[PDB]
């Protein structure tokens, strides 16, 4: 009965009875789509696939349900798309390197045999979000949580080896599997919203000290190309203090997604010793892939992130980049024939962005546990102009700014975090951690900011020549902070990851160096730098582990100006 | 029957502008009207078919003191006991007669030297807070309300703010035990635009009732105004009309004026309003903070430079403004404001120069140097008297080289 | 039946998006489709009435190795023997699975010191060449293809280029005897926009066939991308939709991404793509080179300042980029890239200053002075080894005052 009447890019207008946000199958090729608008007898539908070749005499099938995703064991160490389809199985079912249109395969492996170990017993009353048991997913304790809607006592409950489609327990005349469907546009419910308590360790010496956030917080990494939005976020996907890491390659390079598949199983977690891939879930909808699936990819990883959050773990989601998602919204809203807003974007840009950034939050799960979803969004402003809708709207939703400056990226100062405009509105929530476990860090943090501040002030003065010795000291210490603390080679074997033990010691060794130079201001700085002690501090970050400890107690001996 | 949330099309027999139409499990506001056709904005989210229940009225809220001590949303709907209904009133209110008005002349001391001395706040005066993204603007509001609303009702309207923003206000009210002396209206970030525009309209409808009818002094804080203009632009886009600069509607000024003007001083009570907005891209000439400055009786501009110097509050003394300030400042108080500003302006002028001067410009440079470190810089939990603020100025002057 | 070349209107019983319709002496592409109405773009020029012959397919080209050694247009039509037909394929192709991909790790040495050392080119890597109008960008491409495609197939797509541009490529292929090891697709300047957009689409459709199906390494060069975006904007204008910045369509990024992403490295073969575009007004933040930089894995920015100093290639070492460069650079190779860039960046920094310094900044200034004259400057017919490039750097360092 249903039939297409208009085809316009990713937008397809059909003629028939439809409900809003309903999954459909476009054409005789059955293309997965979603109804977004209704015009009387017609319905506006977006297609998550190619529409180049579709006829007007093609039908559109119904489903009756919304866009969902299989939430269970089989997501770890695997790469999926915007619709949550295995890029591994597609390559194996088709024996081709290309991605066909209209290939509908289940997300999780159906033939995989898991070992379900229950935690509840027969006759026990179960609610929603409760942990019925745990499943060892490659070294991970995947706590199987029941859907938030079910309720009652356990009639039957099993144990041992099962597949993802088998029943592990039956509650109230209804079987319970290891997976459950959930609308990706419908956020997962939580008990209550908790307050910030623990900071979010990233492994980078600038996102942990200068501009750190709390667990369950939100951030933004904007900037032009060549800055390092992908490289920095992957480092966050490498060495984050998190149980579950999610990286959403939204409309970017396919090689940047392949990079994750190649370099992660090789590296090891600085907390478990297990490969990074076991705690990593990939969502891949590249720039050449369907633009409508960019939005779905965002709602997908956010939902899966909330799934492991409801289990009671630490979840981090890296969306790179949100500017492609905003472009997708721009494209769809343009095809619908709606009035454009600022810079061509739709008027409800801030609202749609709020449907993603608000999912973040350290909350109380439905089973009285402490979950945490930290969201890091990447923005790609045209020409490195932060004064743009996508950036400016995100700035009024996040808790911190991790801006990437062009001038720093120009002289190869990576990471090019602009330590002037960048900020953090969650410092007063995380200042308790560092102060308790390391007394003198806020003492030096202000000092580091002060040195970097006046150096920027003196930098407008350097365009003339011929300065006071009390002014030349900041130009000296500023070089030490930048190269020996702010700079962090992401490709160096021992500088890629930096534990707080290494980071704080760098804050201590510079502070110990600063209090020495200020005392010698009675000898010229030229003689102080003649010893070459400052150059020895710069080489510290490139040192391994045991060698780094030994140079610290070697500089301290050179510190002695007696 | 066109359905694309939150905007819908509906056939109605002679509709009404701003008419409320009850649906199955939600409501809607008729924003457009031509013949028997109309467009409506949903309160939240809807899905299925549309039995329509036309009320025949605009959105009216009940007026009482039940709101004082409870948390609500953009519609005034109870989130925490439903308020007594309760004399329904138009949330848009009416235009206050300037003949019945009274120019504010009573200064409300904040305890902040960077405010009380130069650009003090008066009771009933409307004044905004301009702030670059990421700067402690929320703390600046909480610190003010802590000290100027000890004997007043604190009505707070949250406009499109994240859960980290409004709960920063809520928790502060609980810790300071001012939660029961306050009324909070919260419109979430992903909430409907119709909810993000009614929020400051229902908060002031209550404010007008408490202050000008129940005879009280009411302090009203709102945030974020940038989100409010974003919400209004969203509706202006949906309602097929011609946009303007940055897609914003032409009636942006009047709409923002239909909020700020809903405050002042009467012989019965007063409404002290402090709007807050993050300047997009740290630009004061942006379409939102500019028109705001054309309405508000002054503003508090925050400084990234001072913020980078770890200075709280990072208020720019020379950019900040208070028009009705001199209406409460005495002959002695006016002296300090002139001495401070003029020497600080000549100090910063001597900061750009003498870099790459004489003994005269050496003192002014030291003055502005000691002002930012001692006078402007203040602890978040520190209260100062106007005399204490004078003691600081008199001390700085005696160190710079000035009289 | 509306006729205004090259855009036409036509009544078709249930049309198809991208459908090819044979006319009397030409063809057309159905770009629009609503009910029984459709808009089409002609391949060339037409005049008279319109018997329509609907194929029912998108524009499909035959895939073979007949193209290797022949000159074609934007449609793949023979200009020089018609290719064997030949397994027709969709010119748009398909999205390559990133799981099946392989991150390039094999550097293709160009023989150019300003490239090989700092930002080298890898096999399968996509990298663009940004150039101000009138600068030898074409020679930069011909010099690269001369040295990195000695054992590879050189597919060249000409996009809206004058007769002086593509014949500069053709004559070079004949003189270097690489004409039979190449495939050329040329869309003229005054050619139809439908031809100027299919040109890089049919060139890569062949590239995907040769590399990922016939197991080969293919180097693909294209120019001009600025004309391609101009051609796409032309169609976006004809098809009544809402434009954006500078009249360009909103889907500019994705469309440019539907070309650059059609390249990489597989276990069977590889596609080395080098797009080229003249930055309008010498602005890298222009709508065309900006989005290109957001897709391409690095770029080679040309310098007018160096060009005025008679320096070839006029490549800006500090502006140029190669993301996957460090994936092939050894521990020794990485050292030179750091030493070069950092000292050259500190050298130019010492060039702006010390004009109107110390012995330290005297050496770096001399370094950047000797880099542009000896290291960057290279004859068009000069090939250098990576060791020879090291010999230059080591020599410059030993003259500046550096170690």
Question: What 3-state DSSP class applies to B337?
Answer: helix
Q: Is B3 exposed, middle or buried (0-12, 13-18, 19+ CB in 10 A)?
A: buried
- Copy the structure tokens of residue B106: 């009573």
- Copy the structure tokens of residue B59: 């959105």
Within 10 angstroms of residue B9's Cβ, the number of other Cβ atoms is: 17
Out of A53, A98, A385, the one facing C16 most closely (by C-beta) is: A53
| C61: CB partners within 8 A, 6+ apart | C75, C76, C88, C89, C91, C202, C205, C206
Alpha-carbon gap: A309 to the closest alpha carbon of chain B (Å): 18
What is the torsional sign of CA A90, A93, A98, A104?
A: negative
| C354: CB partners within 8 A, 6+ apart | C361, C362, C365
Closest by Cα among C225, C358, C361, C357 to C299:
C225
The single residue listed with the structure tokens 């949550």 is A84
Q: Name the experiment that determined this structure.
A: X-ray
Asked if residues A520 and A559 have their Cβ atoms less than 8 Å apart, the reply is no
- Copy the structure tokens of residue C87: 């397994």
Residues of A in contact with B133 (CB under 8 A): 392, 395-396, 401, 423
> β-strand B7-11 against A42-47: which pairing, if any?
unpaired
- Alpha-carbon distance of B358 to A364, in angstroms, equals 64
Within 10 angstroms of residue C399's Cβ, the number of other Cβ atoms is: 13
> β-strand C60-62 against C153-159: which pairing, if any?
unpaired
The domain at A68-111+177-424 falls in which architecture? 3-Layer(aba) Sandwich (3.40)
Within 10 angstroms of residue B311's Cβ, the number of other Cβ atoms is: 17
- Alpha-carbon distance of C341 to C324, in angstroms, equals 17
Nearest-Å Rg of the Cα atoms of chain B is: 23
Q: What 8-state DSSP symbol labels residue A110? A: S
Asked if residues C112 and C142 have their Cβ atoms less than 8 Å apart, the reply is no
Residue in A with minimal Cα distance to B133: A395
Residues of A in contact with B289 (CB under 8 A): none
Question: What 3-state DSSP class applies to B90?
Answer: strand
The single residue listed with the structure tokens 């997708």 is A328
Question: What 3-state DSSP class applies to B324?
Answer: helix
| Contact assignment for A255 to C324 by CB distance below 8 Å | yes
Asked if residues A62 and A2 have their Cβ atoms less than 8 Å apart, the reply is yes
Long-range contacts at C170-177 (CB < 8 A, ≥ 24 apart)? C170/C71, C172/C142, C172/C146, C176/C146
Closest by Cα among B205, B182, B219 to B61:
B205
Closest by Cα among A88, A138, A81, A82 to A114:
A138
Q: Is C122 exposed, middle or buried (0-12, 13-18, 19+ CB in 10 A)?
A: buried
Asked if residues B297 and B126 have their Cβ atoms less than 8 Å apart, the reply is yes
Closest by Cα among B266, B146, B251 to B213:
B266
CB hemisphere CA count around A134 (13 angstroms): 7
Q: What 8-state DSSP symbol labels residue A4? A: E
For chain C, the 3-state helix, strand and coil shares in percent, each to the nearest 5, are 35, 20, 40
- Copy the structure tokens of residue A216: 């369950």
Q: Hey, is the C-beta of A19 within 8 angstroms of any chain B C-beta? A: yes
- Alpha-carbon distance of B144 to A109, in angstroms, equals 58
Residue A456 main-chain phi, psi, to 5 deg = -70, -35
What resolution in Å is listed for this PDB structure? 3.0
Within 10 angstroms of residue A436's Cβ, the number of other Cβ atoms is: 8
For chain C, the domains span 1-403
Residue in A with minimal Cα distance to C37: A6
Which residues on neighbouring strands pair with residue A372, listed in sequence order?
A: A314
Asked if residues A51 and A10 have their Cβ atoms less than 8 Å apart, the reply is yes
- Alpha-carbon distance of C73 to C159, in angstroms, equals 10
Which residues on neighbouring strands pair with residue A249, listed in sequence order?
A: A284, A320
Kindly list the distances between the CA atom of residue A253 and the CA atoms of A232, A249, A258, B25, C316, in Å, as whole numbers in the listed order.
Answer: 15, 8, 9, 45, 24
User: Nearest 5°: CA angle at A421, between B317 and A385?
Assistant: 115
What is the torsional sign of CA B229, B234, B239, B240?
A: positive
CB hemisphere CA count around A381 (13 angstroms): 22
Asked if residues B315 and B129 have their Cβ atoms less than 8 Å apart, the reply is no
Asked if residues A6 and A12 have their Cβ atoms less than 8 Å apart, the reply is yes
Task: Spell out the alpha helix ranges (H) of A71-197.
Answer: 87-94
Q: Is B164 exposed, middle or buried (0-12, 13-18, 19+ CB in 10 A)?
A: buried
Q: Hey, is the C-beta of C52 within 8 angstroms of any chain A C-beta? A: no
Interface test with A, best of B1, B2, B3, B377 (most A CBs within 10 A): B3
- Alpha-carbon distance of A378 to A390, in angstroms, equals 10
- Alpha-carbon distance of C305 to A107, in angstroms, equals 55
Asked if residues C123 and C217 have their Cβ atoms less than 8 Å apart, the reply is yes
Greatest CA separation for chain C: 82
| C174: CB partners within 8 A, 6+ apart | none
Out of A40, A341, A424, the one facing B247 most closely (by C-beta) is: A341
- Alpha-carbon distance of B285 to B283, in angstroms, equals 5
| Contact assignment for A97 to C100 by CB distance below 8 Å | yes
| A317: CB partners within 8 A, 6+ apart | A246, A247, A248, A301, A302, A305, A373, A374, A375, A376
- Copy the structure tokens of residue C134: 């009138």
Q: What is the DSSP string of A262-275?
A: HHTTTSB-TTT-SB
**Which run of H or E residues covers position A315?**
strand A314-320
- Copy the structure tokens of residue B399: 């160190």
Alpha-carbon gap: A151 to the closest alpha carbon of chain B (Å): 25
Closest by Cα among B114, B362, B148, B86 to B273:
B148
Length of chain C measured in residues = 403
Out of B162, B193, B281, the one facing A387 most closely (by C-beta) is: B281
User: ω into residue A415 within 30 of 0, thus cis?
Assistant: yes
- Alpha-carbon distance of A297 to A290, in angstroms, equals 11
Task: Spell out the alpha helix ranges (H) of A469-545.
Answer: 469-481, 500-517, 525-530, 533-538
Asked if residues A452 and A485 have their Cβ atoms less than 8 Å apart, the reply is no
- Alpha-carbon distance of B155 to B182, in angstroms, equals 6
**Which run of H or E residues covers position B38?**
strand B37-42
The single residue listed with the structure tokens 């400890």 is A549
- Copy the structure tokens of residue C204: 């890569």
> β-strand C3-4 against C7-11: which pairing, if any?
antiparallel
Kindly list the distances between the CA atom of residue A274 and the CA atoms of A381, A448, A493, B102, B222, in Å, as whole numbers in the listed order.
Answer: 37, 35, 17, 72, 49
For chain A, the domains span 1-67, 68-111+177-424, 112-176, 425-562
The CA-to-CA distance between both ends of chain B, in Å, stands at 76
Residue B59 CA to chain centroid, in angstroms? 23
Question: What 3-state DSSP class applies to C231?
Answer: helix
Residue A239 CA to chain centroid, in angstroms? 12
- Alpha-carbon distance of A445 to A457, in angstroms, equals 18
For chain B, the 3-state helix, strand and coil shares in percent, each to the nearest 5, are 35, 20, 40
Closest by Cα among B309, B265, B314, B297 to B112:
B314
Nearest-Å Rg of the Cα atoms of chain A is: 27
The single residue listed with the structure tokens 């449609």 is C75
- Alpha-carbon distance of B348 to B340, in angstroms, equals 12
CATH fold of A425-562 reads 1.10.1140
Task: Spell out the alpha helix ranges (H) of C325-385.
Answer: 331-352, 359-370
Kindly list the distances between the CA atom of residue A138 and the CA atoms of A80, A261, A351, in Å, as whole numbers in the listed order.
Answer: 18, 16, 38
Length of chain B measured in residues = 403
Which residues of B make up each annotated binding site for ADP?
323
- Copy the structure tokens of residue A271: 């907390």
Closest by Cα among B235, B226, B232, B237 to B255:
B232
Burial B78-114 (b: 16+ CB within 10 A, else e): eeeeebeeeeebebbbeebeeeeeeebeebbbbbbbb
Which residues on neighbouring strands pair with residue A285, listed in sequence order?
A: A250
The domain at B1-403 falls in which architecture? 3-Layer(aba) Sandwich (3.40)
- Copy the structure tokens of residue B5: 């949330």
Kindly list the distances between the CA atom of residue C69 and the CA atoms of A530, C74, C88, C179, in Å, as whole numbers in the listed order.
Answer: 65, 16, 20, 6
Could you tell me where the beta strands, DSSP code E, fall in A158-279? 160-162, 169-171, 175-176, 180-183, 192-193, 218-221, 244-250
Alpha-carbon gap: A383 to the closest alpha carbon of chain C (Å): 4
User: Nearest 5°: CA angle at C14, between C9 and C18?
Assistant: 65
- Alpha-carbon distance of B33 to B19, in angstroms, equals 10
Closest by Cα among C141, C250, C158, C153 to C198:
C158
The CA-to-CA distance between both ends of chain C, in Å, stands at 76
Q: What 8-state DSSP symbol labels residue A188? A: P
User: ω into residue B6 within 30 of 0, thus cis?
Assistant: yes
- Alpha-carbon distance of C62 to C67, in angstroms, equals 10
Asked if residues C276 and C111 have their Cβ atoms less than 8 Å apart, the reply is no
| Contact assignment for A97 to C35 by CB distance below 8 Å | no
Could you tell me where the beta strands, DSSP code E, fall in C167-314? 182-187, 217-223, 264-265, 270-278, 298-301
What is the torsional sign of CA A485, A490, A492, A497?
A: positive
Kindly list the distances between the CA atom of residue C30 and the CA atoms of A336, C55, C254, in Å, as whole numbers in the listed order.
Answer: 20, 11, 21
| A128: CB partners within 8 A, 6+ apart | A146, A147, A148, A149, A150, A151, A366
- Alpha-carbon distance of A260 to A235, in angstroms, equals 11
Kindly list the distances between the CA atom of residue B2 and the CA atoms of A11, A334, A394, in Å, as whole numbers in the listed order.
Answer: 17, 18, 31
Asked if residues A94 and A100 have their Cβ atoms less than 8 Å apart, the reply is yes
User: ω into residue C306 within 30 of 0, thus cis?
Assistant: no
| Contact assignment for A387 to B4 by CB distance below 8 Å | no
- Alpha-carbon distance of C4 to C16, in angstroms, equals 21
Calculated CA dihedral for residues B340, B343, B347, B348, nearest 10 degrees: 60
Asked if residues C120 and C284 have their Cβ atoms less than 8 Å apart, the reply is no
User: Nearest 5°: CA angle at B202, between B199 and B203?
Assistant: 80
- Alpha-carbon distance of A148 to C333, in angstroms, equals 56
Asked if residues A247 and A286 have their Cβ atoms less than 8 Å apart, the reply is no
Asked if residues A482 and A206 have their Cβ atoms less than 8 Å apart, the reply is no
Residues in chain C followed by a break, C to N above 2.5 angstroms: 50, 80, 356
Alpha-carbon gap: A278 to the closest alpha carbon of chain B (Å): 32
- Alpha-carbon distance of A256 to A102, in angstroms, equals 25
| Contact assignment for A54 to C321 by CB distance below 8 Å | no
Residues of A in contact with B237 (CB under 8 A): 338-339, 341, 346-347
Asked if residues A202 and A215 have their Cβ atoms less than 8 Å apart, the reply is no
| Contact assignment for A97 to C258 by CB distance below 8 Å | no
Residue B269 main-chain phi, psi, to 5 deg = -155, -165
CATH fold of A112-176 reads OB fold (Dihydrolipoamide Acetyltransferase, E2P) (2.40.50)
Residues of C in contact with A79 (CB under 8 A): 98-99
Which residues on neighbouring strands pair with residue A6, listed in sequence order?
A: A13, C34
Closest by Cα among C275, C163, C278 to C230:
C278
Kindly list the distances between the CA atom of residue C3 and the CA atoms of C14, C40, C138, C263, in Å, as whole numbers in the listed order.
Answer: 20, 10, 38, 38
- Alpha-carbon distance of A215 to A241, in angstroms, equals 9
Asked if residues C16 and C30 have their Cβ atoms less than 8 Å apart, the reply is yes
- Copy the structure tokens of residue C29: 């592409």
Asked if residues B8 and B2 have their Cβ atoms less than 8 Å apart, the reply is yes
User: A230 among the known binding-site residues?
Assistant: yes
Task: Spell out the alpha helix ranges (H) of B58-184.
Answer: 113-116, 138-148, 163-175
| A204: CB partners within 8 A, 6+ apart | A232, A235, A236, A239, A415, A488, A498
CB hemisphere CA count around A403 (13 angstroms): 24
Which residues on neighbouring strands pair with residue C129, listed in sequence order?
A: C276, C300
Residue A25 CA to chain centroid, in angstroms? 31
Within 10 angstroms of residue A461's Cβ, the number of other Cβ atoms is: 14
Closest by Cα among C164, C222, C230 to C191:
C230
């Amino acid at each position: 009965m249903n039939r297409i009447i208009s085809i316009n890019g990713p937008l397809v207008i059909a003629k028939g009875k439809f409900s809003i946000f309903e999954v459909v199958r476009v054409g005789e090729e059955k293309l997965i789509g979603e109804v977004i608008g209704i015009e009387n007898d017609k319905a506006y539908i977006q297609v998550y696939e190619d529409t180049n070749g579709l006829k007007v005499g093609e039908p559109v099938f119904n489903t009756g349900k919304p866009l969902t995703i299989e939430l269970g064991p089989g997501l770890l160490a695997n790469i999926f798309d915007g619709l949550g389809r295995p890029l591994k199985d597609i390559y194996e079912k088709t024996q081709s390197i290309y991605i066909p249109k209209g290939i509908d395969l289940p997300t999780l492996d159906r033939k995989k045999v898991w070992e379900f170990i229950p935690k509840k017993k027969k006759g026990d009353t179960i609610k929603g979000g409760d942990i019925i048991g745990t499943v060892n997913e490659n070294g991970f304790e995947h706590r199987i949580i029941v859907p938030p809607n079910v309720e009652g006592k356990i009639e039957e409950i099993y144990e041992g080896n099962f597949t993802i489609e088998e029943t592990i327990a039956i509650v109230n005349g209804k079987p319970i599997k290891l997976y459950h469907e959930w609308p990706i546009r419908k956020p997962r419910p939580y008990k209550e919203k908790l307050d910030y308590n623990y900071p979010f360790i990233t492994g980078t010496r600038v996102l942990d000290i200068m501009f750190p956030i709390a667990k369950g917080g939100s951030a933004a990494v904007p900037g032009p190309f060549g800055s390092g939005k992908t490289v920095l976020n992957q480092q966050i996907a490498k060495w984050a203090d998190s149980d579950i890491v999610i990286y959403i390659g939204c409309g970017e390079r396919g090689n940047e997604m392949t990079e994750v598949l190649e370099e992660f199983p090789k590296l090891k977690d600085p907390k478990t010793g297990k490969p990074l891939m076991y705690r990593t879930i990939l969502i891949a909808n590249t720039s050449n892939m369907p633009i409508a699936a960019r939005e779905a990819s965002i709602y997908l990883g956010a939902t899966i992130g909330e799934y492991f959050r409801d289990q009671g773990y630490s979840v981090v989601v890296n969306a790179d980049s949100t500017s492609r998602w905003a472009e997708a919204l721009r494209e769809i809203s343009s095809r619908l024939g709606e009035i454009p807003s600022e810079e061509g974007y739709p008027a409800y840009l801030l609202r749609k962005l709020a449907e993603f950034y608000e999912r973040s939050g350290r909350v109380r799960t439905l089973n009285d546990l402490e979950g945490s979803l930290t969201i890091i969004g990447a923005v790609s402003p045209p020409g490195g102009d932060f004064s743009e809708p996508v950036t400016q709207n995100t700035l009024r939703l996040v808790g911190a700014l991790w801006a990437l400056d062009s001038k720093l990226a120009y002289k190869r100062h990576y990471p090019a975090i602009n330590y002037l405009i960048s900020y953090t509105k969650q410092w007063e929530f995380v200042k308790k951690y560092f102060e308790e476990l390391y007394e003198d860090v806020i003492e030096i943090r202000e000092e580091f900011f002060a040195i970097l501040k006046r150096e920027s002030e003196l930098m407008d003065i350097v365009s003339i020549v011929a300065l006071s010795d009390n002014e030349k000291i900041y130009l000296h210490m500023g070089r030490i902070i930048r190269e020996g603390f702010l700079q962090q080679d992401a490709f160096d074997e021992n500088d890629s990851y930096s534990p707080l033990e290494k980071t704080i010691e760098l804050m201590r060794i510079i502070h110990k160096y600063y209090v020495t130079v200020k005392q010698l201001l009675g000898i010229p700085l030229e003689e102080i730098e003649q010893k070459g002690i400052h150059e020895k501090i710069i080489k510290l970050r490139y040192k391994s582990l045991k060698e780094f400890r030994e140079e610290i107690k070697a500089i301290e001996q050179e510190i002695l100006s007696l | 029957p066109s359905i694309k949330p939150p905007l819908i099309a509906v056939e109605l027999e002679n509709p009404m502008l701003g008419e409320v139409i009850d649906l199955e499990e939600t409501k809607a506001i008729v924003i457009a009207a031509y013949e028997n056709k109309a467009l409506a904005l949903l309160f939240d989210y809807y899905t299925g078919e549309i039995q329509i229940n036309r009320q025949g009225n605009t959105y009216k809220i009940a007026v009482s003191e039940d709101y004082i001590g409870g948390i609500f949303n953009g519609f005034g709907e109870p989130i925490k006991p439903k308020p007594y209904p309760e004399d329904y009133r138009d949330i848009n209110g009416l235009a206050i007669n300037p003949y019945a008005r009274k120019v504010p002349n009573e200064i409300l001391y904040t305890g902040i030297s960077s405010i009380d001395v130069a650009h003090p706040l008066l009771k009933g005066q409307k004044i905004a807070i301009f702030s670059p993204p990421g700067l402690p603007m929320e703390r600046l509001a909480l610190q003010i309300a802590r000290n100027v609303a000890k004997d007043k009702t604190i009505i707070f309207a949250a406009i499109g703010v994240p859960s980290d923003i409004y709960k920063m206000f809520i928790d502060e009210f609980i810790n300071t035990k001012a939660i029961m002396n306050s009324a909070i209206f919260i419109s979430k970030a992903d909430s409907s635009p119709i909810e993000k525009i009614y929020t400051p309209r229902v908060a002031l409808t209550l404010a007008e009732y408490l202050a000008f009818e129940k005879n009280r002094d009411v302090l009203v804080l709102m945030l974020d105004m940038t989100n409010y203009a974003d919400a209004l632009r969203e509706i202006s886009t949906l309602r097929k009309e011609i946009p303007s600069r940055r897609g914003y509607p032409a009636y942006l000024y009047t709409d923002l004026a239909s909020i700020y003007e809903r405050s002042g001083l009467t012989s019965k009570g007063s409404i002290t309003l402090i709007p807050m907005l993050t300047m997009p891209g740290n630009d004061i000439t942006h379409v939102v903070p500019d028109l705001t400055g054309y309405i508000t009786e002054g503003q508090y501009v925050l400084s990234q430079d001072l913020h980078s110097k770890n200075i709280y509050p990072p208020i720019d003394l020379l950019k900040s403004l208070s028009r009705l300030a001199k209406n409460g400042m005495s002959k002695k108080h006016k002296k300090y404001a002139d001495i401070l500003i003029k020497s600080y302006a000549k100090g910063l002028e001597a900061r750009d120069i003498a870099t790459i001067l004489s003994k005269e410009d050496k003192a002014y440079l030291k003055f502005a140097e000691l002002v930012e470190k001692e006078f402007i810089k203040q602890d978040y939990y520190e209260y100062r008297s106007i005399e204490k603020s004078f003691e600081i100025i008199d001390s700085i002057l005696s160190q710079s080289g000035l009289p």
